[PDB]
């Protein structure tokens, strides 16, 4: 199928059931549906903690590098996941959110002290 323009992107396709999400990290044409046709599955991400209190992320790093070297873009959640893995630098927005949460918690602690 020929799309007008478009590009490959590595992103998260949502599967699982209601109230139980699961993600497949896939390289797909950006114009394709979220859970539709893809070029290759590059990993998985279970966002729910398991019995060991862990969020399991599988990354096919050889193929991720290959597809990035073939001109594939990255969705922002995928960049954040790769930053958490140590494969990429921590995304700026994660740092900014961490600082914002620090400031909010400091404000709450100051409220507690004031009371």
């Amino acid at each position: 199928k020929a799309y007008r323009g478009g590009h490959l992107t590595i992103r998260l396709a949502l599967g699982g059931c209601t109230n139980r999400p699961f993600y497949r990290i896939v390289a797909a044409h950006n114009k394709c549906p979220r859970d539709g046709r893809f070029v290759e599955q590059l990993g998985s991400y279970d966002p729910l903690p398991n019995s060991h209190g862990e969020k399991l992320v599988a990354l096919n790093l050889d193929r991720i590098r290959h597809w990035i070297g073939c001109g594939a873009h990255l969705s922002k959640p995928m960049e954040k996941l790769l930053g958490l893995a140590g494969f990429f630098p921590l995304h700026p927005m994660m740092i900014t959110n961490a600082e914002r949460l620090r400031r909010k918690r400091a404000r709450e602690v100051l409220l507690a002290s004031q009371k």
């Binding site: 790093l61 893995a85 140590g86 494969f87 990429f88 630098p89």
Partner: protein, 211 residues
């Protein structure tokens, strides 16, 4: 396959009618200053431009008042003047006015760019000519305006690898027998960071379609 000739005829007719009914700059880039909407389409301009649209001048609103449409004069932008301290300007070389405009205040321009004191080699088409953001450098001020001392632009030559990728590089190095203690390192000298407001290529840009 049954030939589809009506489709071809329609395509050719549409192409001919679009290249004969081209909307002009005076029509496309006119603005109603009271409501800040384009009369051609009726679409409102973004809020962050409103004040400038009421205060600043378009490029050819300046060039129409000059001999030869101001070829060779220096033109800067309000946004550049606010954003950057180093001189940013265009040296005009070619101007194509929109003769259909009543005040000849629309058209296209070409020139050589100096951005943050760094001058380019060749002259290319100027973008954002229709923006209300343009100022003309007075002749008696050019010497003071163009003055710039290039500061030492010594930035980082290299950066560390991300933790996991560094670990893999080192692990592969040790597996292949090499025992070097030198840190894996990413070269960033050839990755030059262009400011987001640097002029883009107006030649590659599109145009609003007549309708």
């Amino acid at each position: 396959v049954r030939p589809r000739l009506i489709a071809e005829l329609a395509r050719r007719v549409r192409a001919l009618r679009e290249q004969l009914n081209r909307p002009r700059d005076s029509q496309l880039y006119a603005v109603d200053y009271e409501t800040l909407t384009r009369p051609f389409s009726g679409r409102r301009l973004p809020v962050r431009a409103w004040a400038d649209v009421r205060r600043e001048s378009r490029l050819l609103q300046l060039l129409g008042r000059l001999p030869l449409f101001g070829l060779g004069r220096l033109v800067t932008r309000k946004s550049w003047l606010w954003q950057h301290d180093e001189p940013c300007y265009w040296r005009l070389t070619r101007v194509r006015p929109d003769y259909t405009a009543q005040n000849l205040d629309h058209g296209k321009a070409w020139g050589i760019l100096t951005f943050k004191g760094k001058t380019e080699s060749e002259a290319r088409e100027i973008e954002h000519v229709m923006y209300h953001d343009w100022r003309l450098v007075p002749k008696h001020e050019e010497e003071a305006f163009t003055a710039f001392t290039p500061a030492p632009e010594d930035s980082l030559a290299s950066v560390p690898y991300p933790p996991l990728l560094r670990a893999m590089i080192i692990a592969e190095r040790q597996k292949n027998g090499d025992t070097s203690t030198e840190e894996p390192m990413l070269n960033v000298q050839r990755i030059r960071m262009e400011p987001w407001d640097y002029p883009a290529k107006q030649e590659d840009k599109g145009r609003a379609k007549g309708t």
